[PDB]
Paper text:
Human polynucleotide phosphorylase ([name]), a trimeric exoribonuclease, is crucial for maintaining [name] RNA metabolism, including the regulated degradation of RNA. In all forms of life, [name] catalyzes the phosphorolytic degradation of RNA, utilizing inorganic phosphate as a nucleophile to cleave the RNA phosphodiester bonds and release small RNA fragments with a 5′-diphosphate and a 3′-hydroxyl group. Three identical subunits assemble into a barrel-shaped trimer with a channel forming a central pore in [name]. Each subunit contains two RNase PH-like domains (PH1 and PH2) alongside the K homology (KH) and S1 domains.
Author numbering:
A (entry chain B), B (entry chain A): 46 to 669
C (entry chain C): 46 to 668
The structure:
RNA sequence: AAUCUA
């Protein structure tokens, strides 16, 4: 039992009592909230040629969570917040795993107790760190996670639920030893850049104390690490031979500025098919995947050497230039709001739909209605159809990537959404084409569609992704020099080190999500990435303002309307019907929903004036 | 863009703007309704030994303006209407794919906008044709698709939502060039054969106009088709050798009239096992699938040659004779209605259950799973259990074929269902044995069960499946000679050219679904198949009428009962309970449904008189 | 058609009219309830290397066949009673399949009609026996299945639904020929052991009558069984050679009493890896699965010979000795009740949560009827997370084992739960570690957590699992001698013959689930297993009484509270809001549930007193 | 998905 003091907060780490059969287990307690995290890793390599790591953060009970009704419903039973927490934990621990660790690994978080004051999500990230640190699973260095908020101008570490409701910043920092950053996930209320960057510095300082406490527990326990039967990394001899074969061909392809996404990928694949043939004859004993990964290592190295040495990218841009940006509005008459945002080869269609407040946050069943509430009656639904990348995939159910991307785009637009709007605002973003940051494209497209729809937002929101390419000597592991790329392509995210998504208005930062593929990056690099994104964001907002700069004076005339119709008491029985049968039937044939607000008056919501005409006829004929 | 004029309707076809990464994309607009359809086909051969083709039609109710109803505020699962539309689109485009195209292919329909006037389902079929035509996917000539209605005796092309509700015919025709028909799918309010037949030729004329417009768009934007790695068809010299080995044995098996379904299949399989081992020796280098498919082609040719040359079928029937039909009602005492319909070796058990009216208004707003209500309170649930074919299969959901078969039988019996019935009518059809058109047997058994249950249907409904065997030119492809088969077996559907399922009253037609496997059939064959089915339907109805000819004078004694119970204002709180808890608990353990009618009246629906005795006893003690 | 008489009840069994394409089919009718069961078995062996039998029991309607639900199955699925009934049917017919019958088999039950009087679950078990008996699927003798209930001290065979509500015992017996017992599944209202044992004897007698009726119909039909392409039992030549190689090594491992679960399994796998390599050289032509299964046979045989010959278990204790039992309560402050129960290397964490009574209903007529409503507002949710065995598995959803084990643990604790409790009682049992009877440990842990939470249960409930090792005649098939083991380990469960899970208080039996892996066992062995378990339950109940012997005088100070707020008619519209908007908004921002009592009263349920305070502020400010 | 050192 090791206690770590974080200002006025107390963190307690324990192990050896619960779940002794798991490879690693830990209990993290703050106040009266305890989280038990377990780590299991199979010793037999997985058939899949990557690192299979699954994080499942499960809430035992909100009030009384009980159980989903049936088995297939139970598969749906995973809530949105549990999915988001699992992705944060996964992003915090994935970079620290060794290369070639192709072994099935599962990290499970079980909420032993929740006091309703201390948040269990932060404790779950630390619990994952302690469980892996104490386990025999090879995992490079412990990590510490804290939350930073700003309450009346003061920075608070791990704020309570009450403080978070009055905070202008919701930043979660995961830090590696010697003051590195592994995960950044923020949601700010359009706060200044200087205020934002100071909170990152404060958060990193706290995570070092947690790492110190975890290191003390690890030493006192006497942790021994397993030796995996094989680490799946290409041998240096095969890799340097692949470099000799395809250095010039890949260099010419990556310096060809006439390529598009498909043309470039086909050109690289054409070189690959030639290289794999020659590689197999030279090394017949090599594993079939070892041939594949050797080309990927060589191609990635050549791709990064061009930007490092020449400061020019594969499409002829320099380190700070954006791709072509085009915007459109009100492309379809019937939609309440519409926009088509294009950025390079990334194309996103955004639609705004208004609906009644009751039919937007209120569900029939109270038990499932919890956690489905929206503060401003605002939600964003993000779709990534398989045809966006010319692929075939199932379209049943939202996966975790679409869920996280929708939450990130909703976080960016949330601060500018006005309060007390008469209707629930639902923004739907569909990625028609994907060659880069579709989620930040959904923030810009969603901003345009909101202004077109006529909802009076405070300011336009633009997002951008910042890449990173570093040169690190293996003998030291430190970063010598690096480049920051603005508005990265898909290949730059794939062959880079960080996909630093950052969104906000021209005068502040609204959301941030840094996905670092390196085992930590210095504090200095993150600040420069934020500043570099500030310049790019202002340029994007200039292009957006040309298409539309202010919200329309009013909503479209074919939009929803909210009004009241008087129903007398003597007529209440026939109008509503037995058990609300008549009202339920009307809401089915026509989209009009009728809600009772007074013993004599009923509020009728009509999604369209034409939909009003069918409903108004329905009430009049029943009225007789 | 290309504009196609269809009477007073205008069709707009466009491409090259949205979703440019897919192999083919198209936007089809009618009025303010726009639908985007994309087609993606993999270039590597599928491991499956058939053509994997998936069509998904998603409503995306953001176009309508009322997208969210559930607590997740996003669509969960697939609606019944969405599944049926995906089936219609799939049937329109599947026959036009070349033989041996064993490549994964997905067609996705995104509803960009809907105006509530023009139906997007018809535009989705045309969009699938344009997307496939402009793509590089190997696909035959363009397919036009229109919906033909009859309003005040006038034939209307692509009727609006308002006209579709006043139409006595809902016919969808998909046409190929040269006025061929690839898909027929209709439901009529017991209309005459002459009126039904005229609408078909009117619809085929309009689909040629669409084809001409699509061909112009293909000419304007240059379309080059890909060359697949290979088309998986058996080699001609392999097929002709299999003919030498197994022509005589298959000829004897197919001319043996003492075979049943299982014995005929075993006899053919015995020849297949002996032939395959000889084929492998003759062609050691041949693909293992090429050996399997070569026998299926030879067997299909021998099976069809007997019908064409000798006009005699594999079971001894002629082209017009029906199978033995046995009807029998009143299966069990407690069922409200029941019937056991036997048609050859196809056995179907149909049950009728009377539910409350309140159980039929389940929409997505009330319950997340089920959306929509039936115009008449009547639905048909169709089951195809795995033991019907002596097979093992998952008994879970996600069965597209069962949903499609149930919809076909439901609309076959829909026109005769009486209006303003006091109870919801639920017809459950189970296939106990299957050797043919079990779906059509669900209409015959369903009407027998409806009459046995006491429902005053207007007239009896009988269904039948008409097969087809053609002898086309090996080069021209023109249909030279053909035979229409009445009440086909399973092997006649598998080895045939279409499964022409048409049901109706002795005086009219109520439903039709033509599943053509040929790349279009002449309009003359469709008309002759309709006439041939009219004669067969009369014979089936005569057999059915002997078992039962009119509905029973009253419902069964153990049928549902509805009457009110009066409670005082003082006892309302105790009777209803806190938040309706007492009513929901009594109605969950006793089985009755209680709905409030007035301030003193409660309507109780009891499925059985015994159930009302239990509910009455519970009311008495509560009222004490 | 054959009619079998069971006292005042009548069974009608017929075949040959419905679904003639299936391998086996039968209709079993009692009263106006008819159940149709089919059996399909593939003739091509499956590559699963075990018996792939799946039993699916489906009902057209819920609440005694009064609410149609077949149409809703597409998006909703199968309810838990359908899962439990399928499990019971599977356990009644699985042990009678021949060894090595690795062929896909599916048994499906279709409720043709239900009258709301005769329960179709019992008829489904008999229909599975008749359908398999008349089929060509290789299967052993027929099984008769009856239900026995005690109504006013009288034993009733196949009691009606109305009778079952007034019964103190719900016992389902599946019997084999020669009065053998195949499946036992009982829940009792804390009845005496002697009354429980007599009902088993009565049930076995009634199942013999059904078997004689089924055998008559089989003879009349003239059933001929198929010859399977292969039976996948390991060859005796390979088994005898594996014995020579691993008899001595496995003997030392199983007599090493310092082993724990992981070390013992690792030591066994060490021998398996070496022996399986030597086996391949001796029989290169042997099936690779045959090599695997031959070692499993030898290891099981050596494991059993130690118990029979020496009367010592693999961990050093004797046949009637329990494992080390550790109990602990009140570990987390905010939990309404908690308990950590340890039994050997089995660890179970049990939590008690109080909710409002309205949480039992699901707000929908069909959905609430599908899952039912618990009689005493009490249910137990049982989880078996994959880290309990150091395994990786899909964590979303509850499989068949988790649902059945949770129902067994809920059955044990149900008789002692008090009535008229102001709150809904939810018990969550999580298996942190598993090495034995986790479900039985969930009854003990749940009893500790209920007393700690302050629930006034009538008596503490303890459970245990009894194993069985028999020396059966190679040809005669009779049990020469046997040993009953108390509180078996997982390895003794794996290599044993029975999972006799049995729970009860200090003065009666509350639940029982016998999982027999043999093709029937004599009723004398069953009687001794019940007696041996009563001794073990006494010792367990004494240990748990030291940790906590009586429920706490009151619930925890941070538990739920139900209050009442009075609102005027003028302020009702503002308080409830448009269409109950404000009430639902509060229910999502604080977790409190407000329900209308009358025109003036609203009842507020708050999980914590703090939630009551903040919600009370909202009511005052909104008014 | 069933069974499964649960």
């Amino acid at each position: 039992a090791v206690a770590v003091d974080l200002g006025n907060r107390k963190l307690e780490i324990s192990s050896g009592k619960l779940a002794r059969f798991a490879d690693g287990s830990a209990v993290v307690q703050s106040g009266d909230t305890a989280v038990m995290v377990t780590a299991v890793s199979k010793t037999k390599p997985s058939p899949s040629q990557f690192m299979p790591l699954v994080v499942d953060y499960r809430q035992k009970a909100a009030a009384a969570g009980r159980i989903p009704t049936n088995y297939l419903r139970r598969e749906i039973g995973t809530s949105d917040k549990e999915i988001l927490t699992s992705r944060i934990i996964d992003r915090s621990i994935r970079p620290l795993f060794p290369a070639g660790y192709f072994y099935d690994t599962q990290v499970l978080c079980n909420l032993l107790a929740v006091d309703g004051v201390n948040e269990p999500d932060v404790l779950a990230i630390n619990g994952a760190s302690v469980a892996l640190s104490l386990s025999d699973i090879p995992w490079n260095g412990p990590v510490g996670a804290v939350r930073i908020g700003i309450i009346d101008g003061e920075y608070v570490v791990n704020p309570t639920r009450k403080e978070m409701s009055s905070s202008t910043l919701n930043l979660v920092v995961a830090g590696a030893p010697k003051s590195q950053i592994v995960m950044l996930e923020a949601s700010a209320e359009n706060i200044l850049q200087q205020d934002f960057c100071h909170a990152i510095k404060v958060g990193v300082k706290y995570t070092q104390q947690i790492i110190q406490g975890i290191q003390q527990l690890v030493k006192e326990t006497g942790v021994t690490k397993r030796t995996p039967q094989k680490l799946f990394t290409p041998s240096p001899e095969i890799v340097k031979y692949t470099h000799k074969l395809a250095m010039e061909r890949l260099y010419a392809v990556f310096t060809d500025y006439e390529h598009d996404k498909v043309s470039r990928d086909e050109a690289v694949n054409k070189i690959r098919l030639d290289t794999e043939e020659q590689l197999k004859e030279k090394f017949p004993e090599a594993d079939p995947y070892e041939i594949i990964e050797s080309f990927n290592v060589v191609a990635k190295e050549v791709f990064r050497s061009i930007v490092l040495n020449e400061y020019k990218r594969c499409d002829g841009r320099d380190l700070t230039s954006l791709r072509n940006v085009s915007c459109e509005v009100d492309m379809f008459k019937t939609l309440h709001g519409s926009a088509l945002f294009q950025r390079g080869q990334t194309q996103v269609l955004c639609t705004v739909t208004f609906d009644s407040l009751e039919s937007g946050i209120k569900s029939d069943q109270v038990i499932t209605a919890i956690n489905g509430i929206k503060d401003k009656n605002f939600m964003l639904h993000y779709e990534f159809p398989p045809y966006a990348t010319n692929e075939i995939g199932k379209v049943t159910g939202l996966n975790r990537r679409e869920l996280g991307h929708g939450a990130l785009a909703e976080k960016a637009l949330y601060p500018v959404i006005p309060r007390d709007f008469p209707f629930t605002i639902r923004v739907t973003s569909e990625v028609l084409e994907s060659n880069g940051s579709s989620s930040m494209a959904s923030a810009c497209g969603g901003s345009l569609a909101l202004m077109d729809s006529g909802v009076p937002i405070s300011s336009a929101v633009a997002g951008v992704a910042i890449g990173l390419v570093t040169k690190t000597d293996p003998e030291k592991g430190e970063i010598e020099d690096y480049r920051l790329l603005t508005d990265i392509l898909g290949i730059e995210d794939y062959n880079g080190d960080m996909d630093f998504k950052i969104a906000g208005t021209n005068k502040g930062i609204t959301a941030l999500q840094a996905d670092i593929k390196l085992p930590g990056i210095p504090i200095k690099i993150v600040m420069e990435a934020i500043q570099q994104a500030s310049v790019a964001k202002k340029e994007i907002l200039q292009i957006m303002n040309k298409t539309i700069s202010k919200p329309r004076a009013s909503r479209k005339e074919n939009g929803p309307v909210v009004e009241t119709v008087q129903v007398p008491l003597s007529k209440r029985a026939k109008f509503v019907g037995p058990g609300g049968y008549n009202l339920k039937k009307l809401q089915a044939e026509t989209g009009v929903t009728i809600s009772q607000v007074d013993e004599e008056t009923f509020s009728v919501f009509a999604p369209t004036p034409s939909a009003m005409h069918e409903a108004r006829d329905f009430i009049t004929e029943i009225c007789k």
